[model samples]
Target: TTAPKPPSAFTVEAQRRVEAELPFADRADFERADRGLIRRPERLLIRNPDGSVAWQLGGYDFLLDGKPRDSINPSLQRQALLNLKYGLFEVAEGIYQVRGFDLANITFIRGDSGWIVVDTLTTPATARAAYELVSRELGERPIRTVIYSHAHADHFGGVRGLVEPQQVASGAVQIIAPAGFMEAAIKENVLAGNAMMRRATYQYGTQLPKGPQGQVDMAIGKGLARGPLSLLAPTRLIEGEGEDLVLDGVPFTFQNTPGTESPAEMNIWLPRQKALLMAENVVGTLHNLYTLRGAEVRDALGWSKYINQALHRFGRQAEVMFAVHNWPRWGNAEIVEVLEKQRDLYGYLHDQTLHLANQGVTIGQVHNRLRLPPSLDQEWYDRGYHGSVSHNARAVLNRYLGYYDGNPATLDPLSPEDSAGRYVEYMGGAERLLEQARASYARGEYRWVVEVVNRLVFAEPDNRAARELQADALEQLGYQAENAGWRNSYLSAAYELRHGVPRDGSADALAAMDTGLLFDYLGVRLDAGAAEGKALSINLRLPDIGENYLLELKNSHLNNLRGVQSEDAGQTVSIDRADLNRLLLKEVSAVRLVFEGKLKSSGNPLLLGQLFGMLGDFDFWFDIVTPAA
Candidate 1:
């Protein structure tokens, strides 16, 4: 492995500027973070049953010295320091939080007879660990209700760890989520899941070492916990604008905020406790409008509107405010201040981006021209640690104007490989381009160097000199980045360029996927080229789920209709949902399933094999910085 280099002189200067400009002297956030700490683990390191580390706080010990390192952004160092505060803390009279165990926090609200849990962390192990900590400290109590604040996996994947499936099915424990929760959750992670999961490695820098010159913090939290991810469909859905629900004798006013952070999300208010739970919406740092890992761009205007509504509706009565990530804020004034700033933060980003776009400014130049007013810019929470003004501003422009910059020349650009080959030829050959890039790198033009050298690397990926120079430039950019996502992406690219892509899980039960979505995904997996001359029609019936679909393959496309069986179908396949799931998971071969009579075919059994041959598998480790082979 190539050793990571320290920050260059340019990066050091950038860090100095950030330290001088930001409010590093303000200790208000630190006090608020440490406020209601009940007790913390002496040495917190959680392990799974297989003796593998699940989540631990000791990896971030480098940031505990309270001194900034040149290899990391100083502003990011401050955020990492705050995120390092792990353990159980009291949020309000009866509410508590277990932060720093994962990318999100798990909350425990003491109800009349049991505990009401809100927003489980990313994995089962971390959730169980947090639950065990709560039990150890406050005594064991039954989980009466599980409230999923949003549709994100980090907020709901750990549900099974806290409550058993039997309990939910028996109605002994309630699982609450916003409307369209299951659809949003499955769609986000299933259809494009492989690609998103691959991109998330770079977005989170999961493979990078934890140190000054490597992964520091993921902005909102220290890092994600790696373990088994499980989901439980919600038993209760909050479908209306706002609903008042009494769980275990405590009253909660749930305000559904759709099209905000997640497609399905909500905020909770406790009138008696005088507290507000903003969920993931009002996390300390500026949240993402467009995450790096890939998803639909969030609605910035809608996000701001929801925050404004929350402020007006619950801000005055909210004496204490908490979220799924980061520490809690006490006092009405402080809570109001954060809520208003967060509200205006997104509002300004959205308004000003379009304001610039209206002047005929295109996507490329809009983010460069727009800047937050000093009032909002100076606030620590408004600053970007996960999502920055640069990308979010561009996202707003993309949302309204789309990717086209109104330039006819850019209407349909050449592919990257084609453009790079031509650019290298136009730049007086690869050697000349490399010479100029080296000079630019020496002059602190890191971004320009990376941009030009990327062409050279793509033109000739095997060129060692080009790869090293690009890696060096990307390292400098990573050092100067305030947003952790950008930092991780930069460093991850550098790592891949220098070394190579690392070769990296599981067929859990496939019940979480909707039948229609599963069929849609199968259509996506069909290779059009392989199916060019193939045409077949089949009827699939899953007796257990009482679902039937007629699938047709023609004109190099796969089409399907649910609850319809075509009379011209060439074959009929009957199987239970469990057997189909086993086939999809590769736990049982189709031939074995057929032999065991679990899967029955009325006619032309060979047609199933023909259809399976047309489907293609996705390569999870496809090249990113370099051209694909």
Candidate 2:
């Protein structure tokens, strides 16, 4: 991909404005964040066997050379630039973290018997690199137990890198996680993974080129390690909040806080160390109630109550508090402030959004009134990086009510194309809009210019001038954005507009996908439009995996039956589970598999084809945010 152009005059002025308005260098976080460093690699690089880079710290060397750029927000730039200081850092006596190896920090707790790994990185390769570093410095120790803080992939995808399943099976290693962990983890990304994966490209800025004009930090850390991922199920689950467990002689007080960050999440307190493991619930930065990559709206009220409960339960006693993301907070007073502000942040967003919703305003208008108070907004940790106030407030409104903003017109709104055509017609034409939008852009009314150009672009998707104008507008907004995620997304959209979406002819790297969850996704991807009046049933047998599934399509809904093979089914196919993945994902042709003697069939094979024929093909790069793209 080509590098983006330098910031325009408007963008430069906006950056200057932000620097003047905020107390840019007065914050204490920068000074304190770099205090606890035991060791850091001069050059950190983890390469694949083929010598390809998987994770590295060299790309961010530009950050050390100069001051913040006009293309980046001053406040966000300080955070991202500072985060480049990464390595194995001692949080406390027994707790040490191998940070910057991946998106999430890997914490290794020194145990009497062995090293207890808390939340491995995203992939085995990344995890192994961290493990080697720890072993080199802290001395080699067997991994006794692995704890998954939540159901997210980043928390546990690198399990095999730390220890094998046989160790757990041999009763040598313990695998512990919260209840509903694997189920929630798999389901969160499987059904709608294609879209989420695509959006993640924008949210993380993974696809965008790196520089001041392009990609920067993701707030939580740098981007994910570009390597293969690994997963292992937990052998034991934490039943509920207040549960106590002993691992390798270390006692932990667990508090299950579902809906705070993930569907299945827990926080732990180490009584002996006088430390609290907050999991992902209370990151230093304000977190997402609804992630930009897209998922169900998080429960704001429930999230607030859990933090409140934690304050009452162990707030006073905890000396130091750490989480899965960002740095740790030391001292009882500091920890309490972090906990209280986070609790109130969610509470205020939840209550104020509903308060506006209870009033007669639409969701679109609700955000205007839900601005954070000066007290909350001024707090450093409360600032939005991973999640912003605008989107979170919108999500809270959506949680209580729904997409319908009490506007009857929005209840049954026109499609983007149709609305754009009508709107353009009402505004005269493309020429008239461009004439007015140029004036708006000059006045620094970028959002208005964006809205005006949006109609023109949708009305005429091939309009070159409209697309460029929209890109320019988005670039300016990105420079002005305080939130890194919002900045990356805006800038990514601008890039897509300039150059058409990068159709990088590549398949998804989810090679280790769960077969059961694959079928679950298959069920959801069935084209309801095509299956409107059709009814079909088929029996699929996986001889290698020793599982049987009966699939039925009725009422435009596809349902699955496990361990039951229908005798009267229209088709019956017996195949190995791995081959089934190849066929279903089109990773291999039917002729190729059949020629290789990898597939077997019985009854009518045509029905099997018919079932797959009803599924919809996924478009990797779909339009997000605007009609200009």
Candidate 3:
């Protein structure tokens, strides 16, 4: 196994440029971050019941020195230092936030008799830890309400930790969320889950070691917590804009900002406290229009418009503003300035990208042409920590124009592997290409080195020289990236190139899924090659959930029709939905269930086996840097 290399001289100079260019002299963010510190644990390590770490802040102690490391970007070092602030903080008279415990902060708003929790962290363990810290410091208070700002898992996944579902069911505690919360949440997590989870490792750099040369901050927070993820359906839906609700004696006006950061999200305005809680809508950094882990590209136009609406509706009246991610802004003027800049940040990106696209600037060239104005670029929060101008501009274009660049030659091009082989042959083979790449590396042309060396790596994946040279280029690029997502992605790619791909949750999400989604996932798992030229129909009767469906395979595709069964069905199978879930989770084999008589089958029993055999399992450790075999 190869070891990680130190930053090249080029990377060191790039970091020095960032240190000089950005306004690091402005210490306002650091002051605001450390403004209200009430209590902090001696050790910020949280553990699951099994004693495995769920979240820990001590690993990031390296960033406490507040100095830029040669391996990390200077701007990112500043952000990481700000995110290192941990403990319970008071935002206002009734507002308290627990930051640095998880990827997102959990807020507690005081009520007459209890506390109203806002946006639990990503895992039950971390959420529980945050709550216990609150109770220990601020005295014990019953949780009367839980408000989910959006449908993202980080916001709502820890509900069970704060309050039980039975408490919500029995009306003991109220859970509030935007309309369509359940549908959007399940769609994001369940439908495209396995692939998204795999990609997320790279986005968050979960597998990378924590240090200057490795994973630093996630731009939004420290990093995602690992533990059980749980969800409870909302008891009350904020269906309209400016919906007002008085919970535990605090008046909260909810501004539904759908299709912004999340598909179903809202910002809370407390007129009494003169505070606005901009959930994930407006954070400390320029948020993602498109997350690298993969999801539906967000509406940048709508995102900016919603922030503008918040500004007009409550910007002047609010004296303090806080988000689910970072520290709070205490002055009305400060709040308004941030809101306006963030609003313009997205608006400018959206408008300028389309403006260039209309001028026949294709996706390849649009990102290079568009740059953030000096006003927005000067502001630290407006900088791209999570989302960069390069990718977000491309995302805006893709939303309107799609991926095609209006070039017929690009419509159907050769695959990467196919193209790589030809390119290597034309370049006079791998050794010659390596000699040129080595020169580029020495000359600090990391971008060009990575581009050219990638072709060689893909073409000759077993070539040790190619892989090592490519890793060196990626390491330097990671060192120079100001965007944390971009940094993590670059470093993660380098890690995989050197060490190879390492060998490596929602229970309520399953019950919430309709029969259609389960069948939809089944269709995704069907191996077209294995089922080629096969024509078969199976009737599935799920007695536990009281659902019936017809599953048919023809022309190398699997299709399901709900509430109907075909007479042409060659087999019938009856099972409880719970058992089916177990089967899908691989906890129990289909053959074992059938043999045990738990899965009753009629007609041709072997046909059921035949169909299931065609369903293939995904390789979670699929090769990324190298071409698929």
* Strongest candidate by TM-score: 1
Q: Give per-residue lDDT, candidate 3, residue 9.
A: 88
Which digits, one per residue and each the tens of the lDDT, describe model 1 over residues 514-607? 7778878888899989999899999999999999999889998888899999888999999988788888887899889888988998767777
Separately for all candidates shown, the number of backbone clashes (residues 3 or more apart, or on different chains) is: 0, 0, 0
- Model 2 error, position 450 (Å): 1.2
For 1-629, candidate 2 gives per-residue lDDT tens digits of 23365677777888888777666666676655665776787898888656778788787887887477888887778777756767787878788888788888899988897988899888778889999988888899999988899988787877778888789889888878888786677777778888898898888877676677777787787768876566777888988664888888888888999767888899888888888888988886788999988899999899999998888888878888888877788889989988988899999999998888888666787777787887677776787878888899999888878888776877888888878987888888888888888889888888788878978888888787887888888888887777878888888878877776776611222434555667677778889898899887888888888989898888998888888888888888777887877776668997787678777677777877877788887888787644534
lDDT of 3 by residue, 203-241 (tens): 898788889888999998988888877888888999967
Off by over 4 Å in 3: 503-505, 538-547, 563-579, 586-610
Model 2 per-residue lDDT at 549: 88
Deviation in angstroms for 363 in model 1? 1.2
- For all candidates in order, the CA lDDT equals 0.88, 0.81, 0.89
lDDT of 2 at 531: 84
Sort by TM-score, top down from the best: 1, 3, 2
